[PDB]
A and B are shown apart, each in its own frame.
With several copies, the nearest count.
Chain A
Amino acid sequence: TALSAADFERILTEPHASLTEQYKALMATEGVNIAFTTDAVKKIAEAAFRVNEKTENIGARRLHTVMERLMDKISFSASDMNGQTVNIDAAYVADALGEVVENEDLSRFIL
């Protein structure tokens, strides 16, 4: 079966080497700790699902492209911010990527 909103929430943590862990570790080596609250995991699974039902449904691999946009601000200046516990919550995730509405299909080629 396909992966729902809830199914995208679990695949983000439960699996060994999940994206939540992989970034927790790849950013711990920089000397930085990061918290992935639960109300913020919902807004990443039900925010990568919103994109799969308005474009090609690439599946779980959608999470990678979403995370990479989220862990974009941190991944760059992580070294220059050694020893800090950043709280990634609903407020951060929300204003981390922006919004993604459909293209323009209509107004372009339809009379």
Chain B
Amino acid sequence: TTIVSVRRNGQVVVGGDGQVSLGNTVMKGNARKVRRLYNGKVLAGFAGGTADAFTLFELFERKLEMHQGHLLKSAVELAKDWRTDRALRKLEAMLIVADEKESLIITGIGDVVQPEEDQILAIGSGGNYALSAARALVENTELSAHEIVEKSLRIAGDICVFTNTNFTIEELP
């Protein structure tokens, strides 16, 4: 997939295309890759092959609706469930989560990562392509975080063969 998240002017956007790839064929091309969590309080975009990509999503929910939607705490509470003696399996996927306050990237291996100063996050095969266009724009244009996510996603769909121009974008507030 390509999942990217930009944050500019009290705006937090999170977009992603909609191509479910199986081998080098395309099985579904509309798929919603960015979903809403905690009654609409947090944004989550996933990447990494359905199954794991999903069970990682669920596990972060059972942690938000058990910590009052405190993103950062929910994140770490989840991460710690991997860094123990008795591991929590291992997930072939990663998430980009963000609410009005913070934005993160959580891997099903048990680690939480905070963005770099510019506050831009991308994941998936088309990842860095979007992240390159994003930084390009954020640092040289006035465009809103939505316009940028929109623009960056397309740039990435035209280079990644596992990313299409059929995307779903969500923003906060």
Interface residues, chain A, with chain B CB atoms under 8 Å away: 53, 57, 105-106, 109-111
Q: A110-B113, A111-B32, A111-B113 are in contact. Are A57 and B79 (CB under 8 A)?
A: no
Listed A/B pairs (13) with beta-carbon separation below 8 Å? A53-B68, A106-B72, A109-B57, A109-B112, A110-B112, A110-B113, A110-B114, A111-B32, A111-B54, A111-B111, A111-B112, A111-B113, A111-B114
Interface residues, chain B, with chain A CB atoms under 8 Å away: 20, 28, 31-33, 50, 54, 57-58, 68, 72-73, 75-76, 79-80, 111-114
Residue ID in chain B nearest A57 by CB atoms = B68
Residue ID in chain A nearest B67 by CB atoms = A56
Tell me the number of A-to-B contacts counted with CB atoms below 8 Å. 31
Chain B contacts of A110 at CB under 8 A? Answer: 72, 75-76, 112-114
A109 in complex: contacting residue of B20, B33, B68, B79, CB < 8 Å: B79
Residue ID in chain B nearest A106 by CB atoms = B72
CA A111 – CA B75 in complex, angstroms? 13
Residue ID in chain B nearest A105 by CB atoms = B72
Chain B contacts of A105 at CB under 8 A? Answer: 72-73, 76
B79 touches A106 (CB 8 A): no
CA A57 – CA B72 in complex, angstroms? 17
**Residue from A53, A57, A105, A110 with most neighbouring chain B CB atoms (10 Å):** A110
B79 touches A111 (CB 8 A): no
Q: A111-B20, A111-B32 are in contact. Are A106 and B68 (CB under 8 A)?
A: no
Closest 9 CB pairs of A and B: A111-B31, A110-B112, A105-B72, A110-B114, A111-B113, A57-B68, A111-B50, A105-B73, A105-B76
Chain A contacts of B79 at CB under 8 A? Answer: 109
Chain B contacts of A57 at CB under 8 A? Answer: 68
Residue ID in chain A nearest B80 by CB atoms = A109
A106 in complex: contacting residue of B20, B50, B57, B114, CB < 8 Å: B114
Chain B contacts of A109 at CB under 8 A? Answer: 54, 57-58, 76, 79-80, 112
